[PDB]
Paper text:
Zhx1 to 3 (zinc-fingers and homeoboxes) form a set of paralogous genes encoding multi-domain proteins. ZHXs are multidomain proteins comprising two C2H2 zinc finger motifs and five homeodomains. In transient co-transfection assays ZHX isoforms have all been shown to function as transcriptional repressors. Whilst many 3-D structures of homeodomains have been determined by crystallography and NMR, we report two ZHX homeodomain structures which contain novel features.
Removal of the His tag was important for crystallizing ZHX1 HD4. Inspection of the crystal structure of ZHX1 HD4 (OPPF_2265) showed that, in addition to the normal homeodomain secondary structure, an extra helix is located at the C-terminal region. The additional C-terminal helix in HD4 we label as helix V in order to avoid confusion with an extension to helix III, present in certain homeodomains, referred to in earlier literature as helix IV. ZHX1 HD4 helix IV is fully ordered although no DNA is bound. Helix V in ZHX1 HD4 is positioned almost normal to both the plane of helices I & II as well as to helix III/IV, pointing away from the DNA major groove binding site on the latter. There is extensive interaction of hydrophobic side chains from helix V and particularly the C-terminal region of helix I. Many of the residues involved have aromatic side-chains including Tyr733, Trp732 and Tyr736. By contrast, for ZHX HD4 the network of ionic interactions is disrupted by the presence of apolar residues: Ala668 replacing Glu19 in engrailed whilst Met684 replaces Arg15. The fact that ZHX1 HD4 helix IV is ordered without the bound nucleic acid ligand could be a result of the presence of helix V where its interactions with helix I may help to anchor helix IV residues. Helix V is also unlikely to directly affect DNA binding as it points away from the expected major groove binding site. The two molecules in the asymmetric unit of ZHX1 HD4 crystal are related by pseudo translation, which was detected both by MOLREP and from a native self Patterson map.
Author numbering: 662 to 731
The structure:
Amino acid sequence: GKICKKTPEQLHMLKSAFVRTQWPSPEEYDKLAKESGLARTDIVSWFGDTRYAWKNGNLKWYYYYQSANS
């Protein structure tokens, strides 16, 4: 009984996956499902949601990661 459907560890994995590639290959989605325990259709949807926020200035955690990384 939680609001955040995905666990912190699951979420932290998706964010780390997002930073390497924002358009994962068909096989990379399978792997992320396998290692996260999440259903593939949710991983695919989450990348869509994330990319949508990303192009509209609502993905601060990524921008801030880039302004410290590169």
